[PDB]
Chain A
Amino acid sequence: KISTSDPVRQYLHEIGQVPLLTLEEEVELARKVEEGMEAIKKLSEITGLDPDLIREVVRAKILGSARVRHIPGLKETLDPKTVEEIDQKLKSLPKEHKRYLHIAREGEAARQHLIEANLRLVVSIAKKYTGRGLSFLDLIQEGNQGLIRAVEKFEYKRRFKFSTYATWWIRQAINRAIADQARTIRIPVHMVETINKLSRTARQLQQELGREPTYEEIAEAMGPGWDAKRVEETLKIAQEPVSLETPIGDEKDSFYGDFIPDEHLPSPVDAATQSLLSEELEKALSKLSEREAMVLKLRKGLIDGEEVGAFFGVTRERIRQIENKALRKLKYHESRTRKLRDFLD
């Protein structure tokens, strides 16, 4: 049954059952989140265990069983024995550090609750970044991703409530995505705003001339280093890629694709060519002094394109010697029995 509604209902349901109290509830979870951190750290300190490891084990025992560790991130950690052993030393921590364990867990849980209650916040925001080029579901999701990011750096010690805080973090994550995925071809953010700028400029330029401004106007209006070559180049990138599969001519079964020709593939004639060229050239390669004939033949046609560095040990004078005397003796007896003359190219 058509997505959208169901998930809207889905969290609007859990929000509708649990919104966060303006202060109390928000501040509450927050304080539990930070202490969880302070805890995990101090834990890492007493156990010499990695905070990332402290954080994942507590997460398991609270969020899910071996199911969530195994299928998501492959079984690097022993689904049972590993995480268990870890939880063990947590128990062994006497009355002092044990306390933190209980803190870490509860904090982590607190975290979740904070996240859930503020999903409508994402929806309201994301609801305005609609017609950018992303699915509304995609827009909220990313925005959500931003909310979590917000939950990473919020300092409740600093009175201002989460509301305004998440706003930014979300919007950031949103725009990022918008510029990142909304195209069949990735383009840096700089070039994005640039195109906007150009676009915006064209609008003002579409305001009085009654002439869709020549690349001269746009170059001028935009500013500093803008030129015709520039504008022409930008707009050419702006344009979205059309469908290789599209109705053609008198809208019928004709599909755009069959219309585009090939270039790699050597259409039969070239195949024919390569045959003679190879066969004949090979017949001429065998009638030659190897030394400086193979050097240039291999340096030119076998690796890349260095007179001195072309011959093994014999210096440049013996190179230029056989290179220009064999190649000329080669070119002229071939002038006799004309086999290559007729430029195969």
Chain B
Amino acid sequence: DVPSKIGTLLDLSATELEQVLYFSKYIVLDPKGAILNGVPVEKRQLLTDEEYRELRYGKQETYPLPPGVDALVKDGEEVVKGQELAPGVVSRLDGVALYRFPRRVRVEYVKKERAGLRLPLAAWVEKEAYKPGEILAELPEPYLFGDKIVAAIDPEEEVIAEAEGVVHLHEPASILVVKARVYPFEDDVEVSTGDRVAPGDVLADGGKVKSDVYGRVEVDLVRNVVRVVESYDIDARMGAEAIQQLLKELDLEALEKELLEEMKHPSRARRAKARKRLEVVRAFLDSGNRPEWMILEAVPVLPPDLRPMVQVDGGRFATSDLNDLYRRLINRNNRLKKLLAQGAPEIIIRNEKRMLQEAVD
């Protein structure tokens, strides 16, 4: 309705803000959201998926994967494991792999040039070390005059019972803008933050764990490398959900008095807006009902006989067009529920909530 009764009340872009979050996913930082964009949290401002995504998972997600098998697979490896690669880290082989972002790095897979300091993946492949303590002897002929395999015998990501369970592919060099700890200790002020030397590990696993200002914790049982990304519980929501929240947390009286001041004192502009914004807050607050109801989570269903299903001629049935719309809603909503339970990749949830929204319209 031209004066969006909800946009008027909730001082949000009267006509554009809503449209943006309501039907799509242009989140509005509902409560807190510590971490910055360059400025403090947007208490009631909106952001885009890109900037949003660039908040939760850390400042950068780069996955420059090298070509060939030796070239770039050697420049990075020598400076990826533990070696805190600074901004603009110039890897040196194909072209110039540009690690233009923060803290530490984690390389993915290796081919078959030289194996050293890696994980226990190939450990089983070449018995000697997994079988006995021969990894030291692994060093061919120089040993007579943690990992350090032979000069070069293996090739791809496999299980060596027999060369059956294999996987011959690339070598990703994904830079993860996150701070890596390996030997965190215990200080009992607050609840044990992080981890211990090697034994005790109180941290939640590789997913969502809140320590200090940094808020995500991945785990690598290789070295005691407790990966701690930094963003926090930035309450980000879109669609009627977000708005429902906002409308409930509102002491109309306050905004009634606030506007009272805003109305009479400042110049025409903002005070004019305030008057048109006071009318509704007044109506509601008056004999009127309480405004948390503009939200719909429970759709009444119009009577049956009023939306007949009748027999016409032979096999021809005739019904109110309303019934089709109802199924539209019913199905989506059902698909929704299934979709949340069965697991839920963001894209698909929203994409449906969108449809669901349109359906309700």
Tell me the residues in window 138-160 of chain B with beta carbons closer than 8 Å to chain A beta carbons: 157
The segment from A99-107, A217-225, A313-321 that touches chain B is A99-107
For A323, the chain B residues whose CB sits under 8 A away are none
For chain B, which range describes its interface: under 10, 10 to 19, 20 to 34, or 35 or more residues?
A: 35 or more
For B19, the chain A residues whose CB sits under 8 A away are 1
Tell me the residues in window 217-273 of chain A with beta carbons closer than 8 Å to chain B beta carbons: 235-239, 241-246, 256, 260
Interface: A98 (CB within 8 A): yes
A254 to B316 CA separation, bound complex (whole angstroms): 20
For B275, the chain A residues whose CB sits under 8 A away are none
Residue of A108, A185, A241 most packed against chain B (CB within 10 A): A241
A3 to B84 CA separation, bound complex (whole angstroms): 44
Q: Which of A111, A145, A246, A256 contacts B335 (CB 8 A)?
A: A145
Q: Determine whether the beta carbon of A102 is less than 8 Å from that of B206.
A: yes
For A40, the chain B residues whose CB sits under 8 A away are none
Q: Determine whether the beta carbon of A10 is less than 8 Å from that of B347.
A: yes
Per-residue CB contact flags for chain B residues 244-261 toward chain A (1 = under 8 Å, else 0) read 000000000000000000
Q: Determine whether the beta carbon of B352 is less than 8 Å from that of A61.
A: no
Q: Taking beta carbons and an 8 Å cutoff, which residues of A are in contact with B? A: 1, 3, 6-7, 10-11, 13-14, 21-24, 27, 59, 61-63, 65, 68, 71-73, 87, 91, 95, 98-99, 101-102, 105-106, 108-109, 111-112, 115-116, 119, 135, 137-138, 141-142, 144-145, 148, 157, 181, 184-185, 235-239, 241-246, 256, 260
CB-based A-B contact count at 8 angstroms: 154
A87 to B351 CA separation, bound complex (whole angstroms): 31
Q: Determine whether the beta carbon of B208 is less than 8 Å from that of A241.
A: no
For residue B194, give the distance in angstroms from its CB to the closest CB of chain A: 13
Interface: B207 (CB within 8 A): yes
Interface: B339 (CB within 8 A): yes
Interface: B337 (CB within 8 A): yes
Given contacts A10-B350, A24-B169, A142-B335, contact A239 B343 (CB under 8 A): no
Q: Determine whether the beta carbon of A184 is less than 8 Å from that of B319.
A: yes
Q: Which of A105, A115, A244 contacts B320 (CB 8 A)?
A: A244
Interface: B283 (CB within 8 A): no
For residue B270, give the distance in angstroms from its CB to the closest CB of chain A: 30
Interface: B67 (CB within 8 A): no
Q: Determine whether the beta carbon of B207 is less than 8 Å from that of A105.
A: yes
Given contacts A102-B205, A106-B205, A184-B317, contact A3 B358 (CB under 8 A): yes
A72 to B335 CA separation, bound complex (whole angstroms): 13
Interface: B90 (CB within 8 A): no
Q: Determine whether the beta carbon of B323 is less than 8 Å from that of A157.
A: no
The chain A residue sitting closest to B204, CB to CB, is A61
Given known contacts A141-B339, A142-B335, A245-B321, what 10 new A-B pairs fall within 8 Å (CB)? A10-B49, A24-B170, A73-B341, A105-B206, A135-B355, A141-B355, A145-B339, A241-B316, A241-B317, A244-B308
A91 to B109 CA separation, bound complex (whole angstroms): 30
Q: Determine whether the beta carbon of A157 is less than 8 Å from that of B165.
A: yes
For residue A177, give the distance in angstroms from its CB to the closest CB of chain B: 9
Q: Which of A7, A21, A63, A235 contacts B344 (CB 8 A)?
A: A63
For A6, the chain B residues whose CB sits under 8 A away are 24, 354
Q: Taking beta carbons and an 8 Å cutoff, which residues of B are in contact with A? A: 19, 23-25, 49, 65, 108-109, 157, 165, 167-170, 172, 199, 201-202, 204-208, 219, 221, 233, 241, 308-310, 312, 314-321, 323-324, 327, 331-332, 335, 337-348, 350-352, 354-355, 358
For B204, the chain A residues whose CB sits under 8 A away are 61, 87
For B24, the chain A residues whose CB sits under 8 A away are 1, 6
A22 to B65 CA separation, bound complex (whole angstroms): 14
For B201, the chain A residues whose CB sits under 8 A away are 91, 98
Q: Determine whether the beta carbon of A256 is less than 8 Å from that of B318.
A: yes
Across the A-B interface, give the 7 residue pairs with the lowest CB-CB distance, nearest first.
Answer: A236-B315, A241-B317, A24-B169, A62-B207, A102-B205, A105-B205, A7-B351
A115 to B165 CA separation, bound complex (whole angstroms): 23
For A59, the chain B residues whose CB sits under 8 A away are 343
Q: Determine whether the beta carbon of B221 is less than 8 Å from that of A99.
A: yes
Q: Which of A13, A109, A235, A239 contacts B206 (CB 8 A)?
A: A109
A256 to B316 CA separation, bound complex (whole angstroms): 14
Q: Determine whether the beta carbon of A119 is less than 8 Å from that of B347.
A: yes
Q: Determine whether the beta carbon of B331 is less than 8 Å from that of A65.
A: no
Given contacts A112-B343, A116-B347, contact A106 B206 (CB under 8 A): yes
For B323, the chain A residues whose CB sits under 8 A away are 184
Q: Determine whether the beta carbon of B352 is less than 8 Å from that of A141.
A: yes
A246 to B233 CA separation, bound complex (whole angstroms): 54
For A101, the chain B residues whose CB sits under 8 A away are 205
For A73, the chain B residues whose CB sits under 8 A away are 340-341
Residue of B202, B310, B351, B352 most packed against chain A (CB within 10 A): B351
A selection of 24 A-B contacts at a CB cut-off of 8 Å is A6-B354, A7-B354, A10-B25, A21-B169, A24-B109, A24-B167, A27-B157, A61-B204, A61-B205, A62-B208, A91-B201, A106-B205, A106-B206, A109-B207, A115-B343, A119-B345, A141-B348, A141-B352, A145-B339, A145-B342, A184-B319, A241-B317, A244-B320, A246-B318
A243 to B317 CA separation, bound complex (whole angstroms): 8
For residue B136, give the distance in angstroms from its CB to the closest CB of chain A: 25
A22 to B168 CA separation, bound complex (whole angstroms): 11
Q: Determine whether the beta carbon of A181 is less than 8 Å from that of B327.
A: yes
For A144, the chain B residues whose CB sits under 8 A away are 348
A245 to B348 CA separation, bound complex (whole angstroms): 36
Q: Determine whether the beta carbon of A61 is less than 8 Å from that of B208.
A: yes
